[PDB]
């Protein structure tokens, strides 16, 4: 069953309004009106603000093609609007003509919302009922006519490959569009163009209230409607007020950040930090006239770069013991912070009690707690505008959010916990005033508060766009740069040109910006295309487990930590783990395998090993989980046979250092440097940045006997000069195969091969032709795997694919 048809089953049904199903669903609506289950959920529904709007919203939808629906979080948009449309069609006898699709930002929301809406209809979710969901490679499909289907933006985008006009869908609901994810922004533009050819299509955009008229304006100033809600007053507290209220004092207990840990500072951030440090002395001074000396003493020493989870843990304990009843909701960045805080509470006997319910974001999150019991919900930033818990009275805003950024003049992109915007801070405050006067505790000081950005920039202006560029080409939307300029917030052309060029250097696009076979496969991997290249060749070459380890560390971070004052010995342990590999990436592999078998020897051995080698197990654990997700993507794309990164059949080459390094090269090219001849400092030539240095954290920073002239890297940083963060020595035959254009030059001395014209080394002419040939043979192998992809069988020795792949493997081991 071919890849372009996996989850197509709902879309490919034909919309035919059978007049007896029309009557059957009408007969069923009033039969439901007698089931106590249904009337009981109908009671909860009528107390939502959206219910009061019901027949005003359906009339707006019924009368216009494109509609924007505005409303505070919790008013009913996600769960009620699809129901309002189907029930209006059902009651009017037209119920079968109605095939509603509602898109969701995350796989989890598509499932949860479908199950909730189905519960509100006294039905099972899927299984031929009114409501269901479609995720990539997972389905609970509703009936074919008069149905609501919740899905992900990826599903729609894949659907467009099979039916660019989505002809069988009567209504499409774009939910949570204010989040401004890349895919949802591309979808909006594709749907706008589709309205011209689909006079019958209905399109409903659903947004939180801030900036919801921007979406109206983008759609030709289409009708807009706002579901009103009431918010009770919320007392806000800054870090000063919190520290004063609980007399916070930091506790009886420090590893290195920033440049040592691979963190570049963006210069647009540097301008506002200059305004912060310039205003800081006057702000402290005024604080000392209104807060206690100990409050200010503590405040001027708080770290701005990580949420103080110990402060949050203290504040929660103050709330539970000093404030009236009400659930508490915490907004943290990332699951690393959520589990740390959960364990901070759960280690204390006071919170092990039946009078507390502490939920990291779970069956019982919405259910109101008995008057004794206190609910504490620890959630990521995702619950700002998408999950609503009615019980909440106290909101703790950690003040931070995770967001990728892209540095266009140095082409380095990274992810970090940044300060929330004023808009986020106000949405978080609102969540506390939904049922009674609330309290919102903001974990930033007053000066920081005044210097927040008003809104977070859309992803389209911060992400790197390589993955998006592939999507545009796979949907045959035209010229990449031209199409992107039509988005509601077009990216900068510098970011577009960098992204296209990187894709060409990845060999995902050719010189005419057209997809290669490799690029097609990279489009089916929901990761950055350079990471997709690594993990794909980890599957083809059967070195999956160490490759996925390396891919995860590059995607997230390495597991090494550098406690302040222990630099000399931390680097001592790192290079011990290097083991003659001359590779920061293999070093993580060695540390990771040592960790897996340290934890198998007993968990006191695990704690010892992470401690003698300076590894954060919390980092290791998330790396492990990323490996399984990478595998699942390879499973869905047909390159691997099992969701397990340790499958023996995918790991026959997982101990061959040469092969592993060729795969690292596949993912990191064109980040290549030539090692300078030695006979002092270690420096290397780059294509354009000149002669640069090795980062002091790298296991190669003072390495004097390399065995090849070439290394690949992932991160270059600029402080006073340029530094390569993590580098790996590789053979010229790695670059020759996975690199750019190959050219031969000859004279009396020397047959040289040149790669991208500047990577130059001595090799016979025969190897250049042989590599050009194997590249073509690999293209055909990937091309033939485009329809119904299936993993390479390395147990069939006489396989043509095995013959070609074994030739490539033979070449890189040269």
Ligand X SMILES: Nc1ncnc2c1ncn2[C@@H]1O[C@H](COP(=O)(O)OP(=O)(O)O)[C@@H](O)[C@H]1O
**Count of residues in the chain:** 814
Token code pair at residue 668? 């990191």
**Which residue minimizes CB distance to Mg ion?**
78
Residues 27-56 within binding reach of ligand X (CB under 6 A): 48
What is the dihedral angle through the alpha carbons of 76, 102, 626, 792, rounded to the nearest 10 degrees? 170
- Cβ proximity to ligand X: between 379 and 498 the closer is 379
170 binds, among Mg ion, ligand X, none (CB under 5 to 8 A by kind): none
296 binds, among Mg ion, ligand X, none (CB under 5 to 8 A by kind): none
Q: Are 103 and 120 in contact (CB under 8 A)?
A: no
Piece of the chain touching ligand X by CB under 6 A; list 35-43, 78-86, 124-132, 277-285? 78-86
Applying CB under 6 A, which of residues 25, 66, 69, 74 lies at the interface with ligand X? 74
Alpha-carbon distance 682 to 690, whole Å?
14
Applying CB under 6 A, which of residues 13, 15, 42, 79 lies at the interface with ligand X? 79
Token code pair at residue 445? 């000081």
- Cβ proximity to ligand X: between 125 and 665 the closer is 125
β-strands 751-755, 742-746 pairing: antiparallel
Q: Are 145 and 74 in contact (CB under 8 A)?
A: no
Residue of 185, 131, 178, 126 lying closest to 153 (CA atoms): 185
Q: Bridge partners of 691?
A: 685
User: In the complex, what is the shortest distance from the CB of residue 153 to Mg ion, in angstroms, rounded to a whole number?
Assistant: 14
User: In the complex, what is the shortest distance from the CB of residue 151 to ligand X, in angstroms, rounded to a whole number?
Assistant: 16
**What are the φ and ψ backbone dihedral angles of 202, each rounded to 5 degrees?**
-105, 135
Piece of the chain touching ligand X by CB under 6 A; list 77-85, 441-449, 554-562, 713-721? 77-85
Helices 529-540 + 657-668 axis angle, to 10? 150
Q: What is the CA radius of gyration of the chain?
A: 29
- Cβ proximity to ligand X: between 48 and 753 the closer is 48
Piece of the chain touching ligand X by CB under 6 A; list 66-74, 269-277, 322-330, 422-430? 66-74
Residues 745-784 within binding reach of ligand X (CB under 6 A): none
β-strands 138-140, 131-135 pairing: antiparallel
Helix (H, G, I), strand (E, B) or coil at 710: strand
- Cβ proximity to ligand X: between 432 and 480 the closer is 432
Piece of the chain touching ligand X by CB under 6 A; list 71-79, 302-310, 532-540, 773-781? 71-79
- Cβ proximity to ligand X: between 45 and 718 the closer is 45
- Cβ proximity to Mg ion: between 86 and 314 the closer is 86
- Centroid of chain to Cα 629: 12
670 upstream amide cis, omega within 30 of 0: yes
Q: Summarize as ranges the residues that interact with Mg ion (CB under 5 A).
A: 78
| CA distances for 326 relative to 75, 245, 500, angstroms | 20, 19, 52
The contact pattern for ligand X, residues 88-117, with x = CB under 6 A and - = no contact, is ------------------------x---x-
Alpha-carbon distance 740 to 469, whole Å?
20
Applying CB under 6 A, which of residues 67, 70, 78, 337 lies at the interface with ligand X? 78
Token code pair at residue 501? 């060029």
- Cβ proximity to Mg ion: between 188 and 684 the closer is 188
Applying CB under 6 A, which of residues 69, 76, 545, 771 lies at the interface with ligand X? 76
Alpha-carbon distance 634 to 640, whole Å?
6
- Cβ proximity to ligand X: between 435 and 475 the closer is 435
User: In the complex, what is the shortest distance from the CB of residue 377 to ligand X, in angstroms, rounded to a whole number?
Assistant: 12
Piece of the chain touching ligand X by CB under 6 A; list 73-81, 264-272, 509-517, 728-736? 73-81
- Cβ proximity to ligand X: between 179 and 558 the closer is 179
Does residue 366 bind ligand X (CB under 6 A)?
yes
Applying CB under 6 A, which of residues 11, 58, 69, 75 lies at the interface with ligand X? 75
112 binds, among Mg ion, ligand X, none (CB under 5 to 8 A by kind): ligand X
User: In the complex, what is the shortest distance from the CB of residue 385 to Mg ion, in angstroms, rounded to a whole number?
Assistant: 7
Indicate the helix (H) or strand (E) that contains 51: helix 49-52
Piece of the chain touching ligand X by CB under 6 A; list 74-82, 162-170, 448-456, 701-709? 74-82
Instruction: Say how many Å lie between the first and final Cα of the chain, rounded.
Output: 39
User: In the complex, what is the shortest distance from the CB of residue 113 to ligand X, in angstroms, rounded to a whole number?
Assistant: 7
State the residue for tokens 């092990």: 352
3-state helix, strand, coil in the chain (%, to 5): 45, 15, 35
CA angle 41, 47, 48 (to 5 degrees): 95
Alpha-carbon distance 511 to 586, whole Å?
33
Alpha-carbon distance 568 to 563, whole Å?
10
The contact pattern for ligand X, residues 374-393, with x = CB under 6 A and - = no contact, is --------------x-x---
- Cβ proximity to ligand X: between 383 and 420 the closer is 383
State the residue for tokens 């907004």: 331
User: In the complex, what is the shortest distance from the CB of residue 225 to Mg ion, in angstroms, rounded to a whole number?
Assistant: 16
259 binds, among Mg ion, ligand X, none (CB under 5 to 8 A by kind): none
- Cβ proximity to Mg ion: between 78 and 427 the closer is 78
381 binds, among ligand X, Mg ion, none (CB under 5 to 8 A by kind): none
390 binds, among Mg ion, ligand X, none (CB under 5 to 8 A by kind): ligand X
User: In the complex, what is the shortest distance from the CB of residue 216 to ligand X, in angstroms, rounded to a whole number?
Assistant: 18
What is the dihedral angle through the alpha carbons of 497, 503, 506, 511, rounded to the nearest 10 degrees? -80
- Cβ proximity to ligand X: between 124 and 617 the closer is 124
- Cβ proximity to ligand X: between 11 and 113 the closer is 113
Does residue 433 bind ligand X (CB under 6 A)?
no
User: In the complex, what is the shortest distance from the CB of residue 429 to ligand X, in angstroms, rounded to a whole number?
Assistant: 16
Alpha-carbon distance 542 to 547, whole Å?
9
- Cβ proximity to Mg ion: between 78 and 131 the closer is 78
User: In the complex, what is the shortest distance from the CB of residue 98 to Mg ion, in angstroms, rounded to a whole number?
Assistant: 21
The contact pattern for ligand X, residues 390-409, with x = CB under 6 A and - = no contact, is x-------------------
109 binds, among Mg ion, ligand X, none (CB under 5 to 8 A by kind): none
| CA distances for 778 relative to 505, 535, 544, 785, 809, angstroms | 17, 16, 19, 11, 12
- Cβ proximity to ligand X: between 76 and 740 the closer is 76
74 binds, among ligand X, Mg ion, none (CB under 5 to 8 A by kind): ligand X
Applying CB under 6 A, which of residues 22, 68, 71, 87 lies at the interface with ligand X? 71
Token code pair at residue 633? 């993507």
Q: Following DSSP, what letter does each residue of 311-339 receive, concatenated?
A: HHHHHHHHHHHHS-S-EEEEEESHHHHHH
- Cβ proximity to ligand X: between 69 and 523 the closer is 69
Helix (H, G, I), strand (E, B) or coil at 363: coil
User: In the complex, what is the shortest distance from the CB of residue 178 to Mg ion, in angstroms, rounded to a whole number?
Assistant: 9
How many residues of this chain bind ligand X (CB under 6 A)? 15
User: In the complex, what is the shortest distance from the CB of residue 175 to Mg ion, in angstroms, rounded to a whole number?
Assistant: 6
β-sheet with 716-718: strand ranges across? 716-718, 722-724, 691-694, 683-686, 672-675, 710-713, 727-730
Q: Are 695 and 701 in contact (CB under 8 A)?
A: yes
65-88 b/e (C-beta count within 10 Å ≥ 16 → b): bbbbbbbbbbbbbbbbbbbbbbbb
The contact pattern for ligand X, residues 169-208, with x = CB under 6 A and - = no contact, is ----------------------------------------
Helices 107-120 + 77-91 axis angle, to 10? 50
Helix (H, G, I), strand (E, B) or coil at 114: helix
Alpha-carbon distance 654 to 635, whole Å?
18
- Cβ proximity to ligand X: between 373 and 652 the closer is 373
Query: Which chain residues interact with ligand X by CB under 6 A?
Result: 48, 71, 73-80, 112, 116, 366, 388, 390
């Amino acid at each position: 069953k071919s890849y372009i048809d996996r989850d197509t089953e709902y879309l490919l049904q034909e919309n035919e309004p059978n007049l007896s199903l029309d009557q059957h669903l009408l007969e069923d609506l009033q039969r439901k009106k007698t089931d106590p289950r249904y009337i009981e959920m109908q009671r909860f529904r009528k107390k939502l603000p959206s219910y009061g709007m019901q027949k005003e919203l359906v009339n707006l939808i019924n009368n216009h093609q494109v509609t924007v629906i505005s409303g505070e979080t919790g008013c009913g948009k996600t769960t009620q609007v699809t129901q309002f449309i189907l029930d209006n069609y059902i009651e009017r006898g037209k119920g079968s003509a109605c095939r509603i699709v509602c898109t969701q930002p995350r796989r989890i929301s598509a499932i949860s919302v479908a199950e909730r809406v189905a519960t509100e209809r006294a039905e099972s979710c899927g299984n031929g009922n009114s409501t269901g969901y479609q995720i990539r490679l997972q389905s609970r499909l509703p009936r074919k006519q008069g149905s609501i289907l919740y899905c992900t933006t990826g599903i729609i985008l894949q659907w467009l490959q099979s039916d660019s006009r989505l002809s069988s869908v009567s209504h499409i609901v774009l939910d949570e569009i204010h989040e401004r994810n890349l895919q949802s922004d591309v979808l909006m533009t594709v749907i706008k163009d589709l309205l011209h050819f689909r006079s019958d299509l209905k399109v409903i955009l659903m947004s939180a209230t801030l900036n919801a008229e921007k979406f109206s304006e983008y759609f030709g100033n289409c009708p807009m409607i706002h579901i009103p809600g009431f918010t009770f007053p919320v007392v806000e507290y800054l870090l000063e007020d919190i520290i004063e209220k609980i007399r916070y004092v930091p506790d009886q207990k420090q590893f290195k950040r920033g440049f040592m840990q691979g963190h570049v500072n963006r210069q647009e951030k540097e301008e506002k930090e200059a305004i912060y440090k310039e205003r800081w002395p006057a702000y402290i001074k005024e604080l000392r006239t209104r807060y206690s000396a100990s409050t200010v003493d503590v405040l001027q020493m708080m770290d701005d770069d990580k949420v103080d989870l110990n402060l949050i843990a203290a504040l929660i304990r103050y709330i539970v013991l000093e404030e009236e009843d009400g659930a508490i909701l915490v907004f943290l960045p990332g699951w690393d912070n959520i589990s740390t805080l959960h364990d901070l509470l759960m280690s204390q006997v006071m919170f092990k009690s039946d009078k507390f319910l502490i939920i990291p974001l779970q069956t019982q999150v919405f259910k109101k707690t008995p008057p004794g019991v206190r609910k504490i919900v620890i959630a990521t930033n995702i619950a700002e505008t998408s999950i609503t818990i009615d019980d909440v009275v106290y909101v703790i805003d950690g003040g931070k959010i995770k967001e990728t950024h892209f540095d266009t003049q140095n082409n380095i992109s990274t992810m970090s916990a940044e300060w929330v915007s004023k808009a986020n801070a106000k949405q978080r405050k609102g969540r506390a005033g939904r049922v009674q006067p609330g309290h919102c505790y903001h974990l930033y000081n007053g000066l920081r508060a005044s210097l927040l950005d008003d809104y977070q920039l859309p992803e389209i202006l911060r992400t790197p766009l390589e993955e998006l560029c592939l999507q545009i080409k796979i949907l045959r939307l035209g010229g990449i740069a031209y199409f992107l300029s039509r988005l509601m917030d077009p990216p900068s052309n510098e970011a577009v040109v960098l992204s296209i060029k990187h894709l060409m250097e990845l060999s995902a696009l050719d010189k005419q910006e057209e997809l290669t076979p490799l690029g097609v496969h990279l489009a089916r991997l929901p990761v950055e295309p350079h990471i997709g290249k690594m993990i794909l060749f980890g599957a083809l070459f059967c070195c999956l487990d160490p490759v996925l380890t390396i891919a995860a560390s590059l995607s997230f971070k390495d597991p090494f930590v550098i406690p302040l004052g222990k630099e000399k010995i931390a680097d001592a342990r790192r290079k011990e783990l290097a083991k003659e590999t001359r590779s920061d990436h293999l070093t993580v592999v060695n540390a990771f395998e040592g960790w897996e078998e340290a934890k198998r020897r007993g968990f006191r051995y695990e704690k010892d090993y992470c401690w003698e080698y300076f590894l954060s197990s919390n980092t290791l654990q998330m790396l492990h989980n990323m490996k399984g997700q990478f595998a699942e993507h390879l499973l869905g794309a047909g390159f691997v046979s099992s969701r397990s990164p340790k499958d023996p059949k995918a790991n026959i080459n997982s101990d061959n250092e040469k092969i592993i390094k060729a795969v690292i090269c596949a993912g990191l090219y064109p980040k290549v440097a030539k090692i300078r001849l030695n006979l002092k400092m270690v420096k290397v030539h780059t294509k354009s940045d000149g002669l640069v240095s090795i980062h002091p954290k790298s296991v190669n920073v003072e390495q004097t006997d390399f065995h090849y002239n070439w290394l690949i890297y992932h991160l270059k940083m600029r402080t006073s000069s340029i530094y390569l963060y993590d580098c790996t020595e590789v053979s010229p035959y790695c670059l020759l195969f996975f690199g750019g254009d190959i050219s031969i030059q000859k004279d009396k001395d020397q047959e040289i091969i040149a790669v991208d014209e500047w990577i130059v080394f001595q090799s016979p002419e025969r190897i250049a032709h042989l590599v050009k040939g194997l590249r073509k043979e690999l293209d055909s192998l990937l091309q033939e795997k485009i329809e119904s992809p299936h993993p390479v069988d390395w147990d069939d020795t006489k396989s043509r694919d095995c013959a070609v792949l074994s030739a490539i493997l033979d070449l890189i081991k040269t």
